[PDB]
Design an enzyme around this catalytic site. Structure first.
Site, PDB file in Angstrom:
ATOM      1  N   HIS A  85       0.804  -1.230   0.000  1.00  0.00           N
ATOM      2  CA  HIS A  85       0.000   0.000   0.000  1.00  0.00           C
ATOM      3  C   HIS A  85       0.840   1.284   0.000  1.00  0.00           C
ATOM      4  O   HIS A  85       0.266   2.371  -0.141  1.00  0.00           O
ATOM      5  CB  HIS A  85      -1.081   0.034   1.082  1.00  0.00           C
ATOM      6  CG  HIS A  85      -0.570   0.194   2.472  1.00  0.00           C
ATOM      7  ND1 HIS A  85      -0.387  -0.901   3.301  1.00  0.00           N
ATOM      8  CD2 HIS A  85      -0.229   1.318   3.148  1.00  0.00           C
ATOM      9  CE1 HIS A  85       0.059  -0.412   4.451  1.00  0.00           C
ATOM     10  NE2 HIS A  85       0.162   0.915   4.413  1.00  0.00           N
TER      11      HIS A  85
ATOM     12  N   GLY B 191       2.251   5.497   9.803  1.00  0.00           N
ATOM     13  CA  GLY B 191       3.653   5.424   9.390  1.00  0.00           C
ATOM     14  C   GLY B 191       4.410   4.224   9.939  1.00  0.00           C
ATOM     15  O   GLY B 191       5.534   3.956   9.515  1.00  0.00           O
TER      16      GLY B 191
ATOM     17  N   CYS C  26       3.605   1.171   9.395  1.00  0.00           N
ATOM     18  CA  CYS C  26       3.538   0.086   8.409  1.00  0.00           C
ATOM     19  C   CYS C  26       4.901  -0.302   7.898  1.00  0.00           C
ATOM     20  O   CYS C  26       5.753   0.566   7.714  1.00  0.00           O
ATOM     21  CB  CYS C  26       2.600   0.444   7.267  1.00  0.00           C
ATOM     22  SG  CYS C  26       1.009   1.089   7.822  1.00  0.00           S
TER      23      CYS C  26
HETATM   24  O1  OIE Z   1      -3.825   1.249   8.766  1.00  0.00           O
HETATM   25  C1  OIE Z   1      -3.043   2.078   8.301  1.00  0.00           C
HETATM   26  C2  OIE Z   1      -3.118   2.542   6.858  1.00  0.00           C
HETATM   27  C3  OIE Z   1      -3.901   1.564   6.015  1.00  0.00           C
HETATM   28  C4  OIE Z   1      -3.292   0.425   5.515  1.00  0.00           C
HETATM   29  C5  OIE Z   1      -4.110  -0.545   4.976  1.00  0.00           C
HETATM   30 CL1  OIE Z   1      -3.387  -1.991   4.328  1.00  0.00          CL
HETATM   31  C6  OIE Z   1      -5.475  -0.381   4.915  1.00  0.00           C
HETATM   32  C7  OIE Z   1      -5.982   0.812   5.395  1.00  0.00           C
HETATM   33  N1  OIE Z   1      -5.226   1.781   5.938  1.00  0.00           N
HETATM   34  N2  OIE Z   1      -2.071   2.650   9.027  1.00  0.00           N
HETATM   35  C8  OIE Z   1      -1.832   2.463  10.401  1.00  0.00           C
HETATM   36  C9  OIE Z   1      -1.275   1.305  10.937  1.00  0.00           C
HETATM   37  N3  OIE Z   1      -1.123   1.064  12.244  1.00  0.00           N
HETATM   38  C10 OIE Z   1      -1.534   1.996  13.093  1.00  0.00           C
HETATM   39  C11 OIE Z   1      -2.124   3.221  12.701  1.00  0.00           C
HETATM   40  C12 OIE Z   1      -2.626   4.167  13.627  1.00  0.00           C
HETATM   41  C13 OIE Z   1      -3.252   5.299  13.192  1.00  0.00           C
HETATM   42  C14 OIE Z   1      -3.414   5.542  11.836  1.00  0.00           C
HETATM   43  C15 OIE Z   1      -2.940   4.657  10.908  1.00  0.00           C
HETATM   44  C16 OIE Z   1      -2.278   3.465  11.309  1.00  0.00           C
END
Ligand code: OIE
Ligand code: OIE
EC number: 3.4.19.12
Lengths: 304, 304
Positions: free
Chosen positions: B41, B143, B145
């Site tokens: 992503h 961030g 990820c």
């Molecule tokens: O989840 C995502 C972004 C994303 C990736 C996928 Cl594969 C699908 C949808 N959105 N990022 C994050 C990961 N871990 C903690 C996070 C805390 C706050 C904000 C964002 C965070």
């Protein structure tokens, strides 16, 4: 989101760990620049540990009696000296992996990461607090002595603790990197009173703010309190009295959540008086005090 | 003595972390040999995340669009490919700090350490379990990820997890290092059912053995139970059913303490039916399931 008992990345400290052997005793040492720091009891035999005369014991030792090994390579010891309860072994080679570092004496209630080591090899890393009574509730076995506690600010490691001893109570005692014990402890095999411990109020409040940030809000109430009223409750429950300095350190968390410090104190007062009622806060069924206000903001903001 | 939620030393993994930027998105990558692994992503914009067609999105990208930085130095990308939900960016330089490593797919209930990173820079390390429902209860912000989970056996790092996403529930989902999600998750910004979770029975029993080893023994009783009777209790309390394979894995802990596995099951049965009665076990007021039997013996024996 999510809140974990997070330790600093240990790599910078791993590169400093060496094994120190003297006679039949082996423990860990910290190699920074051309000096290896280790607990002075490495010069003792089990017969000496009841009441060692460290000055006399060290006089029988020469530079060549201190065997220092960094991984598989041997370091050449060109000097030795005792500073309080630590030995400083001068070696002929500066550690190429020496990070930017400082030696600091932390205050009770502050936190740090421990890199537990055996035979100069790192085994694990965990975060803990220096208790108000100057003990640490660590996880250490025989041979862990010389393992260090530290904090990291960007590229600088502030070493604050060197492990020396496990008290008969199963709690841990150690020194700053100048060899001064935290607390009343002495490096002898004798029962030693640690003294009354208390819960770190400012840290529990910080952790309640971390819970609100992460969505655990059931403990918020419609009440407020004063520092005086709260401190009567703190007294009854063996919590550290809260001061304006603690309220000031909680400022950033209070502004982030919009919850006044005394309002959060009222939530803490009610949890102390009523318990959790079978509920949890951030995966815990007790009030957690091993996160400082700085820790909460660092973890909830992502400092690297 | 003492028992902590101990993570593996993170140094070997710190040396593999890089920053990967594509367009306006930056996340972490894992540089092993001449390949950088990161969540696919990184090629998405916020408008794409609702339902990305990753194949079409990747077709618009060339090697020079993937900006890979290891600390302050830039890596030259000579190839890119998508494998499941990960991108593999071939670079012209093998990571000089590549440790001995393996890619493994861990089972639910197993544990691993996470090195949380932002912009290719490590921020902290913590230990956690892969839940039976394949989510992880981590601590991650935007961030994070590309941050990875791993275990270390002497000098070999077994990478088992790469962080991809935070579900709307605040729990975390990710993949093995071949880009296969653990659990039913997809890399899209959509509400996704994680499914019923359960408590890892074998881990709670291991942790009760760790408590006995460390002196917390108040929960031991004069009772025993059978796997059948215990599994009726486990069913009622949403615990994983205990099998003979779990009893076999608990063998070493059972021999160390002399407490038969079914006798410890009876202690666990009573704690489940009666609660802790305001008491604690190893500093916890709930039954802990993030320590495997291997973890308990490693921590109580000192493996480096
Ligand atoms: O989840 C995502 C972004 C994303 C990736 C996928 Cl594969 C699908 C949808 N959105 N990022 C994050 C990961 N871990 C903690 C996070 C805390 C706050 C904000 C964002 C965070
Ligand atoms: O405490 C000592 C040795 C020693 C040092 C001094 Cl300075 C005084 C008396 N005895 N070692 C240990 C440290 N930490 C955890 C240990 C768990 C088991 C066994 C030994 C452990």
């Amino acid at each position: 989101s999510g809140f974990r008992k997070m330790a600093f990345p240990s790599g910078k400290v791993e590169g400093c760990m060496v094994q120190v052997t003297c006679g039949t005793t082996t423990l860990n040492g910290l190699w920074l620049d051309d000096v290896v720091y280790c607990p002075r009891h490495v010069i003792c035999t089990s017969e000496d540990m009841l009441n060692p005369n460290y000055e006399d014991l060290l006089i029988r030792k020469s530079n060549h009696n201190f065997l220092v090994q960094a991984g598989n390579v041997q370091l050449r010891v060109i000097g030795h000296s005792m500073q309080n309860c630590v030995l400083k072994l001068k070696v002929d080679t500066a550690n190429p992996k020496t990070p930017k570092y400082k030696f600091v004496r932390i205050q009770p209630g502050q936190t740090f990461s421990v890199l537990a080591c055996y035979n100069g090899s790192p085994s694990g890393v965990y975060q803990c607090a220096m208790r108000p009574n100057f003990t640490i509730k660590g996880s250490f076995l025989n041979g862990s002595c010389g393992s260090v506690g530290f904090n990291i600010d960007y590229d600088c490691v502030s070493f604050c603790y060197m492990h020396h001893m496990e008290l008969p109570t199963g709690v841990h005692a150690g020194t700053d990197l100048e060899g001064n014990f935290y607390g009343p402890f002495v490096d002898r095999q004798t029962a030693q009173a640690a003294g009354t411990d208390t819960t770190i109020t400012v840290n529990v409040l910080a952790w309640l703010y971390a819970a609100v940030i992460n969505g655990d809000r059931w403990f918020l109430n419609r009440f407020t309190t004063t520092l005086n009223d709260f401190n009567l409750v703190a007294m009854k429950y063996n919590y550290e009295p809260l001061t304006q300095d603690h309220v000031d350190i909680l400022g950033p968390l209070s502004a982030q959540t919009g919850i006044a410090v005394l309002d959060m104190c009222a939530s803490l007062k009610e949890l102390l008086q009523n318990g959790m009622n079978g509920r949890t806060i951030l995966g815990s069924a007790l009030l957690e005090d091993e996160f400082t206000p700085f820790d909460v903001v660092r973890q909830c903001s992502g400092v690297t």
